[PDB]
Amino acid sequence: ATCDDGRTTANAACCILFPILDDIQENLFDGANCGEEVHESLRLTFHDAIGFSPTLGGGGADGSIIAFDTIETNFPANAGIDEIVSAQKPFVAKHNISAGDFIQFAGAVGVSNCPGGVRIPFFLGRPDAVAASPDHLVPEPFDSVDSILARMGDAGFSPVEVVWLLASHSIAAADKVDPSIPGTPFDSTPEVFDSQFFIETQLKGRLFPGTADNKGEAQSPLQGEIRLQSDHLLARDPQTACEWQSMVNNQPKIQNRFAATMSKMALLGQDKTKLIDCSDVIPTPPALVGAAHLPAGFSLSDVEQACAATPFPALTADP
Numbered sequence: 001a002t003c004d005d006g007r008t009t010a011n012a013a014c015c016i017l018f019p020i021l022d023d024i025q026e027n028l029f030d031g032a033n034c035g036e037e038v039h040e041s042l043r044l045t046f047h048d049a050i051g052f053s054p055t056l057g058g059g060g061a062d063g064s065i066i067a068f069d070t071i072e073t074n075f076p077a078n079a080g081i082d083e084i085v086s087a088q089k090p091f092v093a094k095h096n097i098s099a100g101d102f103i104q105f106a107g108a109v110g111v112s113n114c115p116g117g118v119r120i121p122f123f124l125g126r127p128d129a130v131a132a133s134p135d136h137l138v139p140e141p142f143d144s145v146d147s148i149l150a151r152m153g154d155a156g157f158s159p160v161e162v163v164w165l166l167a168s169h170s171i172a173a174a175d176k177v178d179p180s181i182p183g184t185p186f187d188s189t190p191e192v193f194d195s196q197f198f199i200e201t202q203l204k205g206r207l208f209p210g211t212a213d214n215k216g217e218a219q220s221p222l223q224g225e226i227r228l229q230s231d232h233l234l235a236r237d238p239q240t241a242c243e244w245q246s247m248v249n250n251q252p253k254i255q256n257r258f259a260a261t262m263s264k265m266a267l268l269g270q271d272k273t274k275l276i277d278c279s280d281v282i283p284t285p286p287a288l289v290g291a292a293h294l295p296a297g298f299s300l301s302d303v304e305q306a307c308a309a310t311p312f313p314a315l316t317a318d319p
């Protein structure tokens with residue numbers, strides 16, 4: 001199909017997305033960059049979708065975190081998310097798509113701006129949210145591995161799928177974990193969707209980049225970086241350590257698993273056979289330019305190898 005302006009897409013119904021794409025690319029993403037708003041919007045896709053529990057309720061990827069923001073944004077685990085919700089609200093008001101669709105669309109658009117990134121499958125047609133998420137559904141950085149795997153499992157994700165989804169932390173920072181140093185990234189390349197995150201989480205911790213007693217924070221190996229206690233544990237726990245290490249310098253796996261699992265998350269609470277596939281409106285992501293590697297002055301002796309079956313891979317070091 002050919003839309004009013006000459007752009008094409010497989011299903012004509014997808015045409016309404018093109019002006020929305022242009023609007024968000026300039027006005028939310030600072031001109032199609034992989035920056036702060038991309039990161040927050042990708043976080044938002046998760047804090048929307050994971051509000052889903054067979055026992056407790058919540059409609060999943062339904063736009064509830066916008067529609068019921070007054071409730072959801074005051075949950076402790078949602079600290080800091082009010083900023084991006086308030087930034088997305090005017091676009092949702094202005095355009096003719098549901099908040100659930102908008103959140104997933106903005107997340108997939110944003111991720112496509114990141115070198116090494118992926119086009120997450122996107123489906124159009126979610127109805128407006130009809131309930132707030134229950135509290136206590138979003139994993140927290142001071143939660144155990146057992147707790148996180150049980151929560152994500154409750155929502156339908158296996159342990160390997162949790163690791164795959166945490167490739168998100170390759171383009172991410174924290175603002176509230178240590179509010180003395182807001183905006184500190186989880187890897188040395190927060191504007192590149194790469195395996196740096198899985199390498200750097202495996203390094204021996206050395207320092208706290210800000211203050212030293214924050215709940216849910218572990219030592220970081222690098223002054224410009226913050227480490228979550230949840231990521232420290234997942235990189236090391238016998239349940240997840242071997243999958244974690246398998247991501248290192250495995251960019252094809254990161255891409256293919258992240259996109260597939262994000263699609264599954266984007267569809268929590270929904271039914272893709274009632275939705276329309278609009279994946280071809282999402283832009284083509286830029287490529288990686290070079291290999292993930294150790295930071296300057298590090299070596300493999302700085303890696304806390306945690307997988308019994310398989311030696312951590314050789315890596316070069318930024319010299």
Ligand code: HEM
Nearest residue numbers: 039042043046139140141165168172173174175176177230
């Ligand atoms: C599995 C358990 C997870 C835990 C415990 C966790 C925890 C956290 C924490 C504490 C922050 C920083 C919040 C702040 O202080 O500003 C954060 C940021 C973020 N998370 Fe995770 N998260 C998890 C899974 C996920 C998943 C599945 C996604 C997939 C979309 C995701 C995407 C992000 C992004 C992109 C950021 C950066 C936000 C920003 O830069 O402002 N997270 N997460």
Ligand SMILES: C[As](C)(=O)[O-]
Nearest residue numbers: 136137138139151
């Ligand atoms: C039950 As919980 C994910 O708030 O520790």
Ligand SMILES: C[As](C)(=O)[O-]
Nearest residue numbers: 076136140142143
């Ligand atoms: C004290 As809790 C179950 O919200 O991690």
Ligand SMILES: [Ca+2]
Nearest residue numbers: 048051060064
């Ligand atoms: Ca929701």
Ligand SMILES: [Ca+2]
Nearest residue numbers: 170189192194
């Ligand atoms: Ca990165």
Ligand SMILES: [Fe+3]
Nearest residue numbers: 067068069070
């Ligand atoms: Fe509201």
Ligand SMILES: [Fe+3]
Nearest residue numbers: 080083175182
């Ligand atoms: Fe913030």
Ligand SMILES: [Fe+3]
Nearest residue numbers: 188294295318
């Ligand atoms: Fe580097």
Ligand SMILES: [Zn+2]
Nearest residue numbers: 030035036037
């Ligand atoms: Zn900006």
Ligand SMILES: [Zn+2]
Nearest residue numbers: 036037040083
């Ligand atoms: Zn922000």
Ligand SMILES: [Zn+2]
Nearest residue numbers: 019094095096
């Ligand atoms: Zn519009």
Ligand SMILES: [Zn+2]
Nearest residue numbers: 135136137140
């Ligand atoms: Zn809780």
Ligand SMILES: [Zn+2]
Nearest residue numbers: 139140142143
């Ligand atoms: Zn908790």
Ligand SMILES: [Zn+2]
Nearest residue numbers: 040173174175
């Ligand atoms: Zn942020």
Ligand SMILES: [Zn+2]
Nearest residue numbers: 145237238239
């Ligand atoms: Zn364990």
